[PDB]
Each structure stands twice: as C-alpha cells, then as structure tokens.
Write a protein that binds this ligand. Structure first.
Ligand SMILES: [Zn+2]
Ligand SMILES: [Zn+2]
Length: 314
C-alpha cells in the first residue's frame, strides 16, 4: 500500500513520491523509513528531501538516495524553507518526535495555507502536548492523523502493557527459542527490553545490528545465532511450515507484535497487540487536546471518525 499524502492547496508532499501526480510545485517530506512511505523513492531521486537526521542516515544507507538531495532537519526547531527562487514566499516546518520508530517524526507546516499538523505514523504520548511548538496557542487548521487503529471497538493496551504480555509468554517457555517477527525497521526498544529482562543476547541480522548501534542501545545484540534464544526475524518467515522447520533444531515459539488481527495455523505462533500506532482512545485524547478545525485520515482506505465533538470553529 501507499500511505503518503498530497496535501491539497499546499506545496506539501509527505511520503508521496510519484513525480507525475505530485508535480513540480511541491516540497517533499519523509516521516519515516517504512516501505509504504517510500513507494517510488530510490537512488534515482533528484529533488530536495526533508526528513529527520536518523531517517537521513537510513535513507542514504539503504536506498542510496544522494546526499545532495537529502536535507536532514534538526528536530524541535523551526526551519524556514523557500517556496521559490526569488525570496517571495517561504514555509516554516517543525519536526516533532512521532514515537513510532527510529527517525519517525510529525510535521508542523506553517505558510500561506495556514497551520497544518501532520502526524505521519505515531504513537500518542502525553509529552507530545508539552512540545514547545504546540504550546504557543497556534490554531491548527488541519490535522492529518494516523488512523491505523481508529476502531472504537478495538481496545489496545499501552506498549508497556503489551510488552508485559510478551514477557509473560516468554517466561512460560524458558527452554524455547523465541522468534520475533518484525519489519526491517522498528520495535528495537522492545528487543532491548527483552534482552535485559531475560539476560540474553538478542540475535539480529547484520542490517539490524548496524541500525541498533546507531540508536546507541545497550550492548545486548549479536549476529551469532548460538549466542541467544531470542531471535529477531522478518515477520513473513513466521508461518506453520517454518515452525516445524525450527522445531527440528530446537523447541520454538513465534511472536507477532502487531495490532492487526492476524490468525495463525500453528498453536505456537502468538499474535500480541503490541502496536506502534495510536489506539482509538489515544487518538481521541490527542485530538481533544489540540482541537483542530478539521481532521483528515492519512490512511485513506481505513476508517476514521469520532472527532466532530472535538473540533474548533475557526
Ligand atoms: Zn510506520
Ligand atoms: Zn505506515
């Protein structure tokens, strides 16, 4: 899927890389390095690209986008970007920690269009309201929201509570190897927590270890499989056939940390609602505190509602 947006009546494109559809009167932004946000973005990209410093490093390393075009913006600062070559108009952009994955940010856009807050992918935490850029009384005219888990019937625990569910599960199997199905990026802090909790080395891929060292996490990761019982694998590897394959070597439990209602054939495959996306209740509190004039879903194909009673008149 493609979860990028061309914001109408603005010079803004976020996680949206189709040259034909975007046009030439746009500035391009990248919230984070998940593949559904970099569709069409590769080493051939030849336009200015604005992102976080961590995203900037990952972008050049793994997609080979030239450093000529990569524009790393410091988080928490107001950046003034030119919209033309004659110093006629500018746009002010402020990056805010999205609490989603390494490098993930929210964008605060200010310009002729007004004020727009673009969350990208984010997990709401109350500290986001205490952001200096959001405590200036500025009216947010449009709030683009991560509506991934925007289902009122879907109750999700906090990441800490979900991490506890994972810990409890692993505790029941002290003799088992543990397969954690992940994307190439994200939930590294979960791995670090599991490493310390069970005093084990967490086996990664050479790519992940390279990433972890950038984050400056604890020295608890390695590429040698014989070193630990907790293994970070690609989520696609977790299925019935691979469970039988893995059990030939050692008793194995597989864990899928996701808010998606994935069902498994194998009894030893566990799907636990550990999510990097805000829950419905967290979304409600986020919007209620900001009170924007309008709320627009980033994930168009997915449901998004229940925010009329939290909007602002202006
Ligand atoms: Zn994401
Ligand atoms: Zn996404």
């Amino acid at each position: 899927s493609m979860n990028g947006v061309l914001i109408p009546h603005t010079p803004i494109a976020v996680d949206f890389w189709s040259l034909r559809r975007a046009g030439t009167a746009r500035l391009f932004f990248l919230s984070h390095m998940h593949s559904d946000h970099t569709v069409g973005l590769s080493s051939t990209w030849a336009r200015p690209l604005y992102c976080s410093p961590i995203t900037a490093h990952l972008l050049h390393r793994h997609l080979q986008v030239s450093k000529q075009w990569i524009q790393a913006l410091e988080v928490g600062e107001s950046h003034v970007l030119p919209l033309d070559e004659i110093g006629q108009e500018t746009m002010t952009v402020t990056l805010l920690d999205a609490n989603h994955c390494p490098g993930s940010v929210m964008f605060l856009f200010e310009g002729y269009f007004g004020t727009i807050l673009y969350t990208g992918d984010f997990r709401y935490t109350p500290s986001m309201l205490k952001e200096p850029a959001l405590t200036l009384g500025k009216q947010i005219h449009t709030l683009y929201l991560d509506n991934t888990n925007c289902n009122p019937a879907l109750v999700l625990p906090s990441r800490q509570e979900a991490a506890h569910q994972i810990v409890q599960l692993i505790r029941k199997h002290p003799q088992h190897n543990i397969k954690i199905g992940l994307y190439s990026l994200g939930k590294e802090s979960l791995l670090e927590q599991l490493a310390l909790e069970f005093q084990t080395w967490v086996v990664l891929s050479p790519r992940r270890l390279e990433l972890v060292q950038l984050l400056g996490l604890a020295d608890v990761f390695t590429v040698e499989e014989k070193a630990g019982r907790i293994h970070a694998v690609d989520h696609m590897e977790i299925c019935h056939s691979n469970m039988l394959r893995w059990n030939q070597t050692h008793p194995t439990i597989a864990i899928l940390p996701t808010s998606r209602k994935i069902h498994s054939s194998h009894p030893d495959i566990h799907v636990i609602p550990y999510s990097d996306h805000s829950s419905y209740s967290e979304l409600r509190a986020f919007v209620a505190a900001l009170k924007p004039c309008q709320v627009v879903p980033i994930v168009s194909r997915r449901p998004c509602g229940g925010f009329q009673d939290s909007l602002s008149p202006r």
